[PDB]
Amino acid sequence: NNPEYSSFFGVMGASSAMVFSAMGAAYGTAKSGTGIAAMSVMRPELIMKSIIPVVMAGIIAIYGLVVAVLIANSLTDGITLYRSFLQLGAGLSVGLSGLAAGFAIGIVGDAGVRGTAQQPRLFVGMILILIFAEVLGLYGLIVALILSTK
Amino acid sequence: NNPEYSSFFGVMGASSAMVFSAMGAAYGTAKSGTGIAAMSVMRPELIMKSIIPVVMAGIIAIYGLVVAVLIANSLTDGITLYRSFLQLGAGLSVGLSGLAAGFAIGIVGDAGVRGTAQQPRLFVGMILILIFAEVLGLYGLIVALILSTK
Amino acid sequence: NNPEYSSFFGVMGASSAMVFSAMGAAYGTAKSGTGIAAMSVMRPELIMKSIIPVVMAGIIAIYGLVVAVLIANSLTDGITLYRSFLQLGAGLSVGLSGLAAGFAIGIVGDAGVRGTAQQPRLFVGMILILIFAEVLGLYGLIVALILSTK
Amino acid sequence: NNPEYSSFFGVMGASSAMVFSAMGAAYGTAKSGTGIAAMSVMRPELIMKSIIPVVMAGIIAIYGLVVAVLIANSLTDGITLYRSFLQLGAGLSVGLSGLAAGFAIGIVGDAGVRGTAQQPRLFVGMILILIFAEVLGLYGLIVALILSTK
């Protein structure tokens, strides 16, 4: 009844959900780590407080995992192709939104951290612009949950 | 009956609405957060009023979420190609119009914030420019609402 | 009767009309925003007048929207392939001509506003040249209206 | 009777004729606009004369429109393949010769306007050069009319 190739798309859902979110979180953490490292040279005190861009990149990595486990736990022999496309769309939707969020967390994390050294009042601004970067991962999740559980 | 592959285009539509608008809102956030962070050293007070580019970048991702949800709720195994293609069109229309709006919000937001730092008059100007950016995401939404409901 | 895939071209028409016109309007708005912002330091007054290239970039997105809605209302499941190709052609013909117009408004807007701040007489020249940029979208619209209705 | 996948080539004719001509007129307008803007700072009086390259670029869009309109009116459901390819060849021949003329006008307009502000005697040399530039749009038109009525 259901097609041979049907589960390949469901698999590409799970894999993409993880891989592109890992890419997003890796980029977010690579830029943010660069920023924190170079910032800390004249600001011991900020080393702990400044890790929030990294923590929010670590959340993008969990949005990838959540969808990737939710897809993975729903793959099977009988999958009717329609559910596999839903799963691919879910996996790309969280995954590439995680990639976009990770890009934004990276850039605002680097610039925001460097600026926070120069002016500690920036820190609340850095949190606000990061909520607006991190929420793209959440929209990526919301769509992916809806698709993968339609 | 209708081809089994037909749901694919609708799902890629849903994914596209989220993904390309997340790329838009990410780029808009990344450039805006760069400009805000670079401003803060010279003008610590403006960092609150200068959030608005980021808020509009967030709004482009909300438009792509809306169409990604409306598409994602409008799916079934037997979906006619005609309707699935509407959903692909809707997805790319909001998605890439949100990406376009994101390129605008980013470049306008960065240059507008770093200008406003040097020139307190510019704020009243750049909000009008940011509105003429963000309305691209709204035009994309309008065509996506129109397409997905034929 | 038509083949199942028939509506695809017409939908890519509706989307392309909006998408590439939104890209033209984004490029024109981004370059114009950069110019306006960067020069306003020397010229606090010219921010209220130098908006016109932004408005014209916005008008290119309106030309996209007009065709995108006119195409999208002209869709149906039963559409003959001829009308479906005409709708793709119309969509590209406004969309990419809008992208050409937006390129011209971007470059003329940026250079025009910079020059105007260095020499206020340029403002009239800039408005004339921007109309010659903006009408490229309107020629794209003429051809889209002709194609979409025959 | 006649195969479909045949009205499409004629539509690509009309589209190309408008799109690549609008691109040509955009690059011609944009480069000339950068010239005129940068020029006007040193010689504010020359604006009203130095519009010529913009209008010489302007005719390329109109040559595109002439062929786009002529092709578009000549389309039909089940158009003979031979007549449809003729419309493709026309559409490219004007559209891309328009593009060639667009660059030719852009480069010699940008250089010629700058040169003219340093030396008013160049005004005649510039418009002489703009003949052998703008005539490329006209030759794209000649062949396009020949093909469109062959």
Add this chain to the structure above:
Amino acid sequence: NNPEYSSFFGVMGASSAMVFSAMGAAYGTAKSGTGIAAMSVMRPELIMKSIIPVVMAGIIAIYGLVVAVLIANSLTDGITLYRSFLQLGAGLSVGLSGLAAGFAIGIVGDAGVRGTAQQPRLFVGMILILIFAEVLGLYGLIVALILSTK
């Protein structure tokens, strides 16, 4: 009888003869016009001698027109592939030999003119060099005439 679709290559021959020779003549004109314009500031008398690279570039577009018209006049729906290919090869032979000649004319026009303003004795040399750049278009035309009429 013989293949339908045969027209396509013959039509592409007409378009290639025009488009590529228009690209050649645009490059030739453009590059030469930057030379004339930049030179004229130093030597306001040499303008009317210095046009010759622009004129020879224009003649490359005439060669492409001649072949394109000859091809277009020689098209028919029933065209045997032998004549259709002969038209494509003629089209590319002038189109791209004209492009090559146009490259050469653009470079030797600019270098010839900039040199000639520093030393008027070069003018004869620029003409002799330019004849060898332009004759490539004439060779391309010869092969195109021989092919398209074979």
Add this chain to the structure above:
Amino acid sequence: NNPEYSSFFGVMGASSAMVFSAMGAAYGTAKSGTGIAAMSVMRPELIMKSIIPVVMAGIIAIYGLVVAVLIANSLTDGITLYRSFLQLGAGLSVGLSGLAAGFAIGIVGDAGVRGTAQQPRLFVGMILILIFAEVLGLYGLIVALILSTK
């Protein structure tokens, strides 16, 4: 027995001989003509000798024309693929050997001509290396005459 479409290879033979030999001779000429006009400002007496690289660039285009004519006058409707591929081989074999020789003539022309103005003895050296650059066009010819006559 003879297939349809046989002409394509033979015709691309004729065209490739002319086009790539024209590209070769256009690069040979563009570099040499740059060299001559940049050089001759200091040395008017060398103009009427330093033309030789350009004359040798012309001869590469003649080898192209010879083979392109020899092919074009030996095509027939329904030619066997064996003669047709041989005509492609001859076509490329002179055409690209002329392109290669065109690069060499260009570089020895530019460097040898410009060097001569500071050192007259180089001119005879430049002639000899330029024969070694020219003769590759002649090896291309020898192979192309051979293939086109099997």
Add this chain to the structure above:
Amino acid sequence: NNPEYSSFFGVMGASSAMVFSAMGAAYGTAKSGTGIAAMSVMRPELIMKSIIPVVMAGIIAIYGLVVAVLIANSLTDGITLYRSFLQLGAGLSVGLSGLAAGFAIGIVGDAGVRGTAQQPRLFVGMILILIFAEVLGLYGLIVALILSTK
């Protein structure tokens, strides 16, 4: 008897043997002609000695010629694919080897010419290094003489 296309691979064999060794010898000659130009201004007496890398680059293209002639003399319509692919092998094997040896002769030639000029003890060193470079062309020839006679 044998397949229609069969003779084509031997034809491209004959072409590649000449074209690729032409490109190598062209580069060889161009680098060496540049080195000769920069050397001659200081050491004009040295040219007749510094011709060595040029004549060796000309020899590389004779190895291409020899194979392209042998392959071409071995072609026929009735050729078995075995003989045809052996001849394509001969074609690339001399062709790309001659191309590569030409690159080594060019670069070692330009250095060896500029080096000998400053230090006469290197003239024998340049001759030796170039003999290793020529032998790489001879290896391509040896296998191409084997394959074209197999």
Add this chain to the structure above:
Amino acid sequence: CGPKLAACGIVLSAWGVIMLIMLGIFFNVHSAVLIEDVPFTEKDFENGPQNIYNLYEQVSYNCFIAAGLYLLLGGFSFCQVRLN
């Protein structure tokens, strides 16, 4: 007001009256070129020209009323151009 606005109001008044009265004429003669401007529906072809003739009267009245607004704009502007 200002003289700029009064001058714009004169130009707009002249143009508006000229075009809208000329449209009034073409609508009153039931000119075929004006068919696309008349806001009819697929049901208005019933029985004959009766519905389209009633709509031709309505669009003639639309243009006549709009020309009245341009006459009022005119009379205002011809005062303001002297007062500013």
Add this chain to the structure above:
Amino acid sequence: SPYNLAYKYNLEYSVVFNLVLWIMTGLALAVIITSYNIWNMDPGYDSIIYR
């Protein structure tokens, strides 16, 4: 068609396709490369770019 007959795709179709695909990719690259080269050509206004 009532019998569901095939779309009558011709022989030589792989040859038509590999003519039109590669001729069009060659033409489209020749246009794109040339267009890129002229669009990014040096406009050469050194007499004013610095004043």
Add this chain to the structure above:
Amino acid sequence: IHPPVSYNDTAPRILFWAQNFSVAYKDEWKDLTSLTFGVENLNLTGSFWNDSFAMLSLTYEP
């Protein structure tokens, strides 16, 4: 459109069609189309079908 040949055994098993069916003996060509498609009396003798083999058979007497 000419009706396809339809070998029937309990249900349709083999469907066959052409735009034109022709043969030649000693290069003398004949058109079989009117002698074949839509011909209700067409002689299908020696035809056979199986799950894993099939033999369509068309007999012409004149």
Add this chain to the structure above:
Amino acid sequence: SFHCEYVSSLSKKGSLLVTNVPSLWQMTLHNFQIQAFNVTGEQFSYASDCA
């Protein structure tokens, strides 16, 4: 199912019918279409084309 433009013994029409020996016979099936297992109704299923 299967579809071909020319199941034929003639080289001008593709030579799909092959004889390893001399033959007194020639044949051509212009737009040949065939289907001979898992048929349903009198209607052909989607056809793989020979080109």
Add this chain to the structure above:
Amino acid sequence: VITFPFLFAVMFGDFGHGILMTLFAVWMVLRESRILSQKNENEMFSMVFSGRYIILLMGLFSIYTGLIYNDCFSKSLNIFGSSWSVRPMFTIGNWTEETLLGSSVLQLNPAIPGVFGGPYPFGIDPIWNIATNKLTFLNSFKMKMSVILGIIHMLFGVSLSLFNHIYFKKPLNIYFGFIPEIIFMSSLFGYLVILIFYKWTAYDAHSSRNAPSLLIHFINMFLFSYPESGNAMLYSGQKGIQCFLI
């Protein structure tokens, strides 16, 4: 003084813009004494004001071209009558079925006698403003018109050259320049203009099927290469005329 207003009006022809331009130019003239006192710094206004008389004249010609083209914003003018056919003219018992088809679907008017009103006494007929095919009709005409106007002004231009070389007493220029130049131009142009006017009189709706294409005969004339086949010739002995003029 006239030729520039005329060509500009051919490019720009529209009845409404012709009126507006005329009104503004008239205003600039009738208020000239007041307006001449105004600021010189508005170079745009100074340009049009110094142009006021030339702008009036081209505005008047722009009304003229707008009237011949019978267009104001794609609307007709009530000044001219009509040659177009009412439905009673289709229902002559011939093409009564086309009237019934016209109730079901779009149709093209036959232009046949008994249906068509016969030759039109004015510019473009009003019906062309509503017609879906109007651009194909008008484009053929405007193209052919443009070719003629340009030919005639170039024929004037070489004639102006003759006067100028005479007033400089240059026999060499008139003898070796003007004579072969006018012959070159006139032989090419004359054939083309003759064919354009001939087509408009020698053919009709009946002769429209298989009617010869003018551009092909023009190209073939310049090529010296009509292959005795394809398009039918337009008139008796035309081959000799082609051969002679080229």
Add this chain to the structure above:
Amino acid sequence: RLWALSLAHAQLSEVLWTMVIHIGLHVRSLAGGLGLFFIFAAFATLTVAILLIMEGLSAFLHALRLHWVEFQNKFYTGTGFKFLPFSFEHI
């Protein structure tokens, strides 16, 4: 160029009418009368900017190009000193 510009002007005018003016037409006298007034004011603004200013300046320069090159080159040398009398009209 004559034809080309004439087509472009017509099509720009047709689009502006169809996009702007058509929306002003309504089935009741008061509603259509108020709508048309603002609709035609917006329309007139667009016709001035696009047609009168831009297509006007286009047509103007093209008609001059035809004169300067494609008519005058057969008969007018266009080289010579402009006469400039010394007058108090230069003050």
Add this chain to the structure above:
Amino acid sequence: HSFALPVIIFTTFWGLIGIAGPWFVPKGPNRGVIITMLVATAVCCYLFWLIAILAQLNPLFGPQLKNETIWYVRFLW
């Protein structure tokens, strides 16, 4: 009635403007301008009108009308 009557009317009208107009111009410095304006006006108007009215002769194909316009051509006229 015949098309020749319009042609003779138009030819007479512009012919008088282009001949009798000049023959009534006074002597004065503007004379050559006035004559040139009259002649060039008559030639351009005559040629332009003549081309348009001649092109309307013997139409090779008529107008094509939208469905609704064809239905209105039953009754409006």
